[PDB]
Amino acid sequence: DLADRFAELERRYDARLGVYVPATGTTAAIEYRADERFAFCSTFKAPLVAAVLHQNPLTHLDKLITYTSDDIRSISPVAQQHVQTGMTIGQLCDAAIRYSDGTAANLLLADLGGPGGGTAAFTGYLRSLGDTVSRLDAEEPELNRDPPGDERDTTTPHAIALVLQQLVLGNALPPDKRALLTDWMARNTTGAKRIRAGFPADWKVIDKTGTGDYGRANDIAVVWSPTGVPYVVAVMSDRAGGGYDAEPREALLAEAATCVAGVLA
Numbered sequence: 001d002l003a004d005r006f007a008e009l010e011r012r013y014d015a016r017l018g019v020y021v022p023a024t025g026t027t028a029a030i031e032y033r034a035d036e037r038f039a040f041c042s043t044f045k046a047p048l049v050a051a052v053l054h055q056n057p058l059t060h061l062d063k064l065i066t067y068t069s070d071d072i073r074s075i076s077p078v079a080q081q082h083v084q085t086g087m088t089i090g091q092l093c094d095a096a097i098r099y100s101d102g103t104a105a106n107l108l109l110a111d112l113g114g115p116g117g118g119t120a121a122f123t124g125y126l127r128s129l130g131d132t133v134s135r136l137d138a139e140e141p142e143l144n145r146d147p148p149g150d151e152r153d154t155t156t157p158h159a160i161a162l163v164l165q166q167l168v169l170g171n172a173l174p175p176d177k178r179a180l181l182t183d184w185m186a187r188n189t190t191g192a193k194r195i196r197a198g199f200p201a202d203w204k205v206i207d208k209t210g211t212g213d214y215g216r217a218n219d220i221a222v223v224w225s226p227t228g229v230p231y232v233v234a235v236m237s238d239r240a241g242g243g244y245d246a247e248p249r250e251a252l253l254a255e256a257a258t259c260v261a262g263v264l265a
């Protein structure tokens with residue numbers, strides 16, 4: 001019914017689209033490939049900073065972290081500007097959410113500590129939320145590179161939407177920490193052509209994007225209707241049929257999102 005447009009959209013872009021909007025009191029859950037595994041790509045950075053916040057007192061945001069140019073291995077628009085000074089955990093969080101900074105995410109994982117540079121603690125962190133499905137296995141940028149069907153570094157639209165749900169609308173974080181996670185997503189700079197572009201402007205949209213190879217383009221978001229009702233939208237997509245080199249298509253995420261808005265209005 002709405003499945004007919006999502007599959008319609010998949011045909012248009014030669015894509016696989018996963019969509020999840022958790023049910024509220026007034027609205028029914030929206031499921032499209034909701035429980036199929038998609039790659040996190042950079043979408044993991046939002047629950048990752050929640051992993052850091054949850055584990056640490058606010059005072060920890062001021063911990064200065066140093067690193068070398070050798071640590072800068074992926075898209076890091078902020079971390080490159082700070083090889084000489086380093087960054088505090090807080091700005092690493094800021095960098096990780098608002099600019100999808102990959103090196104900043106890697107150091108936050110290292111701050112999570114432990115095996116695989118913190119990927120097991122981060123997976124462990126998702127389990128604490130009730131997400132038994134997801135796993136992060138590599139750091140940036142290898143986690144964007146797993147071949148299709150490989151279960152490493154994947155989540156599901158269902159799984160991630162519910163994780164975000166407790167992070168932003170629930171009680172996964174104390175209120176003062178919840179406020180920090182929400183504002184970074186709210187002033188994120190990377191999702192203007194994705195979920196945000198499909199909803200009317202008078203809807204509020206906070207989001208964290210993800211992009212990888214095989215045409216992988218994700219956006220996880222929390223949106224508020226003009227009346228102020230919150231919904232969570234998971235939109236995930238890849239274009240594996242085109243190989244490692246498949247171009248990501250943002251139009252797919254904006255088009256799909258509009259469909260969601262049409263049903264949520």
Ligand SMILES: CO/N=C(\C(=O)N[C@@H]1C(=O)N2C(C(=O)O)=C(CSc3nc(=O)c(=O)[nH]n3C)CS[C@H]12)c1csc(N)n1
Nearest residue numbers: 077078081094095098099184185186187188189190191192
């Ligand atoms: C909500 O995001 N919208 C954006 C966008 O990408 N802008 C970014 C955002 O939020 N930015 C911020 C900052 O971090 O505050 C800034 C400041 S960044 C900065 N601050 C310092 O104090 C410093 O010492 N050095 N630097 C580099 C300007 S735009 C960028 C945008 C860009 S053009 C346009 N019309 N919108």
